[PDB]
């Protein structure tokens, strides 16, 4: 569920980005479609953060 994103970010060590995604109105179905370029436009400027998010998205879509 979309309400699970903050907990997800927290365990990924990405809790610092939770506020930007809420302010940018990103819901679960949008989140699951994001690419590296989308994350860059969202302000995620370090590779390690973007890649962790993309791999997380990939796992959520696989399961």
UniProtKB/Swiss-Prot annotation:
* Top-level taxon of the source organism: Eukaryota
Q: Which organism is it from?
A: Homo sapiens (Human)
Name by which UniProt lists this protein: Protein bicaudal C homolog 1
Family note: Belongs to the BicC family.
Described by its record, this protein's role is as follows: Putative RNA-binding protein. Acts as a negative regulator of Wnt signaling. May be involved in regulating gene expression during embryonic development.
| Related illness | Renal dysplasia, cystic: An anomaly of the kidney characterized by numerous renal cysts and apparent disorder of differentiation of the renal parenchyma. Kidney of affected individuals lack the normal renal bean shape, and the collection drainage system. The cystic, dysplastic kidney contains undifferentiated mesenchyme, cartilaginous tissue, and immature collecting ducts.
Taxonomy of the source species: Eukaryota, Metazoa, Chordata, Craniata, Vertebrata
**Impact after mutating residue 59 to G:** In CYSRD; may impair splicing; hypomorphic mutation
Can you state the subunit structure given in the record? Interacts (via KH domains) with ANKS6 (via SAM domain) in an RNA-dependent manner. Interacts with ANKS3.
Which cysteine pairs are covalently linked by disulfides here? none
Full protein segment contained here: 874 to 936 of 974
Q: What residue stretches are annotated with the SAM domain? A: 1-63
Q: Where in the cell is it found?
A: Cytoplasm
């Amino acid at each position: 569920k979309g309400s699970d994103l903050p907990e997800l970010f927290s365990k990924l060590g990405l809790g610092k980005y939770t506020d930007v995604f809420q302010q940018q109105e990103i819901d679960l179905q949008t989140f699951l479609t994001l690419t590296d370029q989308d994350l860059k436009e969202l302000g995620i400027t370090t590779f390690g953060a973007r890649e962790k998010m993309l791999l997380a998205i990939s796992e959520l879509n696989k399961n």
